[PDB]
């Protein structure tokens, strides 16, 4: 059931902006850990006296890292005279976000046909405005509305290189790292109440509930017309034996925010080999692999989709496999990206649903809760 | 002229603490860029609900990275009931330091015979107290006094593994990186007025002016009795054609602070080869190398100390060479470690003055200003 009810033309995920305390160290860590190239910059060397902003890219995936300078550098400026390249940036807002949440995503940006129209229709339909539409060098239009917590949904539209005022980075400083990551598949938010969050966001976007298929959480996925922009939202479930992971997120994040980014790889095995080689030399750590029970039980579930050799490669890399009625999903999760048990990353690859591949092919891993529990119980048995 | 006037027994440099917004990403970046091992941690997994602290080590060099958690995690605590492993840590002080200065050194820590006595004598002699002496698990004593700006001089003494409450880090997560860095040689502060800063610090430590040997700055070096603890201090000189680099520091740092850390390598050529291989894949960038004029003029100055082959290796690595009347100094400087043009790192190796090597053997590079200017002028000539 896809009603195609988008209230404005949405194209694709455009970028993810992290608000940092020091953008340089986060961007260099992410570049090496994920194999993303330094591609654009806006900072003191480009005339930006307000914020330091560094763009990493892998395929179509764009990660932006931004941190404020001393406000004293731009004290003479006013918004009309600003040297910031992102006019929605605010020293106070950024310092407050980072002190409240630690390292985290500030903007989920989507490209649309007309950012000014997307903003107006959204706000007309209940969206809480964050930054009004602003035209940059008569070329790009940027606008922001609240999504959940302190995360904004950012609309970008081009009349026709990232943003005006950004410079492509020098060749020597731009090493062509690539571990196979190609685009952002989905971006997941954690909220205290799922119902009102769903009603708010679906209310101003016209996004529809994506069709899917007792421990932890409840969730639902909002989707654009072609289901290429996908936004799952989680809420905690209280009363369980094990403390809900969503609740722990909310406590350590000081409220709602973005929980994880799901990054599509064109070759998840090569991606994971490359990231795992760097886990202890400045990259990212991964969640503990499931027990070999899980991989023993993979044969009857996905034996028609993956060969026994490709299954064994899943076992040594710790990859999880799930399947719906239209496709199969390979996935794995990192440990938290920063000091707090909050934001993390998922690497995925989808197989099936070719027309191009349709969005969400394979779902989002819903059946992995039951299969993992069954695996831990059967592994204990296999141990005793 | 070494009066040996230390007012308390000072041993060696013990560690450098960075105050960060996210300690995880800075520590992983530094570990890979400098080849330092993850060795100890104090964080949520060790019961610390206050700050995340990660220790990197290479030889005797200890880099500590600390960032605050949400204060809500420790809201029920009081100083007697604290779970912090560094009792001088304060949420407000840290957030204020980082928002004012960006990424930077908060503590220069020196090991002394008795931290409580060092604190008392210092304060008796004009030192501005920062954190009174605190005994940790009846094993280590920690105290802090103001050094310059918001940097503290930290005294540590052991009755007899970094600090109580820290845990050695798991073997898998601890990769034995080593590029040859072995200890901290000196730590340099930038201040607006050199005279009063010298008088304050020498006044409460009894440190003496280290004997050395028109553009930029004036400086002087304070030294402990055996001249193993070395603390140079710079002030800007105004009125020059080129804006003083010390003045730019003060503006972007919002005042006085630590300008650079000088790290001794046992093999500066191997250190620089290893760091330069990683400059564009998440490590550190280096200042532009001097012109080959400089290396052409190296023969007559240090031709008795380095061979023509060892000189050519200096040329391709960009190393600078200086010499006093007792030793020779190999040095090189990184670009700023973070977003701001503030803190950077120096890699050095000293040759000569063996008794063990005496401290400061070769000086601190004073003659490199004249030689670099002469080189740029002779290179322009060689160009025309
Ligand atoms: O997949 C989701 O919808 C989000 C999510 C996934 C795993 C998890 O443990 C918590 C939330
Ligand atoms: O060496 C010093 O005493 C500090 C310093 C060195 C080089 C420089 O450009 C500025 C300060
Ligand atoms: Co997911
Ligand atoms: Co120096």
Swiss-Prot record, chains A, B:
Q: CDD domains under this entry?
A: HPPD_C_like, HPPD_N_like
Biochemical pathway: Amino-acid degradation; L-phenylalanine degradation; acetoacetate and fumarate from L-phenylalanine: step 3/6; Cofactor biosynthesis; prenylquinone biosynthesis
Q: What is its main location?
A: cytoplasm
**EC number(s) per entry:** 1.13.11.27
Keywords annotated in UniProt: Cytoplasm, Dioxygenase, Iron, Metal-binding, Oxidoreductase, Phenylalanine catabolism, Repeat, Tyrosine catabolism
Name the InterPro entries on file.
4OHPhenylPyrv_dOase, 4OHPhenylPyrv_dOase_C, 4OHPhenylPyrv_dOase_N, Glyas_Bleomycin-R_OHBP_Dase, Glyas_Fos-R_dOase_dom, VOC
A Gene Ontology BP annotation from the UniProt entry? L-phenylalanine catabolic process
Q: What class of enzyme is it?
A: oxidoreductase
Q: Which GO terms describe its cellular component?
A: cytoplasm
**Cofactor comment:** Binds 1 Fe cation per subunit.
* Entry's transmembrane regions: none
Q: Where in the cell is it found?
A: Cytoplasm
Q: Which terms does the record give in the GO molecular function aspect?
A: 4-hydroxyphenylpyruvate dioxygenase activity; identical protein binding; iron ion binding
Q: What does this protein do?
A: Catalyzes the conversion of 4-hydroxyphenylpyruvic acid to homogentisic acid, one of the steps in tyrosine catabolism.
User: PANTHER family, alphabetically?
Assistant: 4-HYDROXYPHENYLPYRUVATE DIOXYGENASE (PTHR11959:SF1)
Q: What is this protein called?
A: 4-hydroxyphenylpyruvate dioxygenase
Species of origin reads Arabidopsis thaliana
Provide the gene name from the record: HPD
């Amino acid at each position: 059931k896809n009603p195609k009810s988008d209230k404005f033309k949405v194209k694709r995920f455009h970028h993810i902006e992290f608000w940092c305390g020091d953008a340089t160290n986060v961007a260099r860590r992410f570049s090496w850990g994920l194999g993303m190239r330094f591609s654009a910059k806006s900072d003191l060397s480009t005339g930006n006296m307000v914020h330091a902003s560094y763009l990493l890219t892998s395929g179509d995936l764009r990660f932006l890292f931004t941190a404020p300078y001393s406000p004293s550098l731009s004290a003479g400026e006013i918004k009309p005279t600003t040297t910031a390249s992102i006019p929605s940036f605010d020293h106070g807002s950024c310092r407050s976000f980072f002190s409240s949440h630690g390292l985290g995503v500030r903007a989920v940006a989507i490209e649309v046909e007309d950012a000014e129209s997307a903003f107006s229709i959204s706000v007309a339909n209940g969206a809480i405005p964050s930054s009004p539409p602003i035209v940059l060098n008569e070329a790009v239009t940027i606008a922001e509305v609240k999504l959940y917590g302190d995360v904004v949904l950012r609309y970008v539209s081009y009349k026709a290189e990232f943003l005006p005022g950004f410079e492509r980075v020098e060749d020597a400083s731009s090493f062509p790292l690539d571990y196979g990551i190609r685009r952002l598949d989905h971006a997941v938010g954690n909220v205290p109440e799922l119902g009102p969050a769903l009603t708010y966001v679906a209310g101003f976007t016209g996004f529809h509930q994506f069709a899917e298929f007792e421990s932890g959480l409840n969730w639902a996925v909002l989707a654009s017309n072609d289901e290429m922009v996908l936004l799952p939202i989680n809420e905690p479930v209280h009363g369980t034996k094990r403390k809900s992971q969503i609740q722990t997120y909310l406590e350590h994040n000081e409220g709602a925010g973005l929980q994880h980014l799901a990054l599509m790889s064109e070759d998840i095995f090569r991606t994971l080999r490359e990231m795992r080689k760097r886990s202890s030399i400045g990259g990212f750590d991964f969640m503990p692999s499931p027990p070999p029970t899980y991989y023993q039980n993979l044969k009857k579930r996905v034996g028609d989709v993956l060969s026994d050799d490709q299954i064994k490669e899943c076992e040594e890399l710790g990859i999880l496999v799930d399947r719906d009625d239209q496709g199969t999903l390979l996935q794995i999760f990192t440990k938290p990206l920063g000091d707090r048990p909050t934001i993390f990353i998922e690497i995925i690859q989808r197989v099936g649903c070719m027309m191009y591949q349709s969005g969400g092919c394979g779902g989002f891993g819903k059946g992995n809760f039951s299969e993992l529990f069954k695996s831990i119980e059967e592994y204990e048995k296999t141990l005793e």
